[PDB]
Design a binder for this molecule. Structure first.
Ligand SMILES: CN(C)c1ccc(N(Cc2cscn2)C(=O)Cn2nnc3ccccc32)cc1
Ligand SMILES: CN(C)c1ccc(N(Cc2cscn2)C(=O)Cn2nnc3ccccc32)cc1
Lengths: 304, 304
């Protein structure tokens, strides 16, 4: 029993982190096989970031201008290319610690672990979610760029995020491992404001199921609702619309607890309308939305 | 910017996890050098746990009755001994992945990361704190026993906790790596109730400092207090008494923000008396107490 915001064990990703320096800029890179992936803004000075022309800036860079250090050993760069907003630095040595891996582009509402790094060294690991506005609420300082987000399915690491920037509002933006930003963000230090950070309804419901499984049941009421009625309330509270696809995904949690998905929706509707009244659910005074239904099953079943 | 409940990178501890089976009981062990540490209740059946005589149960066990598997390879047990509530199984092979390590016994209020494991395989990593009542609020299922808690100082892992049990209230109890339980708990399935789970005041203040550093300042008021006046309020709210030692520990955060420790105490006093009024601090609707002042500095400075 007990329910925690749990990250994946980070070891497989730690063995991939390297330091990439270009000129006076140093950030992190991800070394998989004989390729090091890093944000393309490693070629920029702080001045360049205001209005960078990446193709033009990259012309002034050669393989020897990219310094890649894995631990305390230097890697030889034998090629470089820009793919969208990432650079791919081909090195002469395959990472001997390369885990089985995939590059995946996640959808909003999906969660992943971040291994925050500085100078190619891991500092910490935390769990977060791709917000519906395509930002993440991470913990990143200057030098954290190139830190990655990932999920693990037994022995395969699915890399889904690479850190690139912090918006003026303190929220974070980045790309998948093909260098495409999540959302409309660009790697330029300019006016970029995020859209509405709505609540991930399906994740809140999954977390209410986790609460029932772990003993917190005070919020279960005597009501039910329909998807349309629930969604009228969800819209009012800046919650994402719940679809039949989300109801289907919650099927296994509904089966385990014996609480119909629409009954849990009616409990959530009452929590939105009445508030918590100073009470807590799984040690939280707000409705948590960074656990997917798959995370709740994984944690409550002990998948390794 | 941004502030997350961050765990230490778990790789160094993943390389130490093994599966220990004795008879029909399987749990996790920690392999450091040529010794595997595990809860002594690996020798018990579920029936034995009601009233176990560990010395008597251990007489019926020989080295070959302890099956230790590291990955998919079996380790040879050449000795076994009981130290307090842990067994030390001497194996014929030193763990080649043994990191630099220390065994430390932490004080209540101190935080650490837990690598939750099942069958010797890591499932996840989360951050938690030793509560003032010597319980931890973890996420552990049957089979998680022997999972460890630790802190990392650059390359040295300080192991501080080994999981042994879940109390009937869903909270967790365990030992240090010398096998001594934290608090008054015993490894017997009997009536063991935890004392008051008070709030770790110094950690709440550290987290309010982290909030100020990360932009959340709405709760800063125009007041100050004294340690004695603050403590009269802290007692009323089941918060731990704040000492001059705690004020000294918050000195660096007070210096960085320019907010005197007693002024932050007065802000906390007002939050206790007035509540949050539906507002949040660092995305939380309650006052978080599982970040120490050292954690706030580490995270806000990017220590690797
Ligand atoms: C290459 N160069 C020196 C540089 C310099 C600054 C940035 N920016 C500015 C920027 C670009 S668009 C919006 N803001 C970053 O956002 C990088 N970054 N990422 N996470 C951070 C957390 C704290 C502080 C800085 C952080 C990128 C590159
Ligand atoms: C050896 N044997 C089969 C066994 C069987 C049961 C236990 N107990 C019972 C107990 C002893 S004192 C209070 N309760 C445990 O608490 C072990 N455990 N630890 N974390 C758990 C989380 C969920 C479920 C079980 C969990 C220990 C050993």
């Amino acid at each position: 029993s007990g329910f925690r915001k749990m990250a994946f064990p980070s070891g497989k990703v730690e063995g991939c982190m390297v330091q990439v320096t270009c000129g006076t800029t140093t950030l992190n890179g991800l070394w998989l096989d004989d390729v090091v992936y890093c944000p393309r803004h490693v070629i920029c000075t702080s001045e360049d970031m205001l209005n960078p022309n990446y193709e033009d800036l990259l012309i002034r860079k050669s393989n020897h201008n990219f310094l890649v250090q894995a631990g305390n050993v230097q890697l030889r760069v034998i090629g470089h290319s820009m793919q969208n907003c990432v650079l791919k630095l081909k090195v002469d040595t395959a990472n001997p610690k390369t885990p089985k891996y995939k590059f995946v582009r996640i959808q909003p509402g999906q969660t992943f672990s971040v291994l925050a790094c500085y100078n190619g060294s891991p500092s910490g690991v935390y769990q977060c979610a791709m917000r519906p506005n395509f930002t993440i609420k991470g913990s990143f300082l200057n030098g954290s760029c190139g830190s990655v987000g990932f999920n693990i399915d037994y022995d395969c690491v699915s890399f889904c995020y690479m850190h690139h920037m912090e918006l003026p509002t303190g929220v974070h933006a980045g790309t998948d491992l093909e260098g495409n930003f999540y959302g409309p963000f660009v790697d330029r230090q300019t006016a970029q404001a995020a859209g509405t950070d709505t609540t991930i309804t399906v994740n809140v419901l999954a977390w209410l199921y986790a609460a029932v499984i772990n003993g917190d049941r005070w919020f279960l009421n005597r009501f039910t609702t329909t998807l349309n009625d629930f969604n009228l309330v969800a819209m009012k509270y800046n919650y994402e619309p719940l679809t039949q696809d989300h109801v289907d995904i919650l099927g296994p949690l509904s089966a385990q607890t014996g609480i119909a998905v629409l009954d849990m929706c009616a409990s959530l509707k009452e929590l939105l309308q009445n508030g918590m009244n100073g009470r807590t659910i799984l040690g939280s005074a707000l409705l948590e939305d960074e656990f997917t239904p798959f995370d709740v099953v994984r944690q409550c079943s002990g998948v390794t």
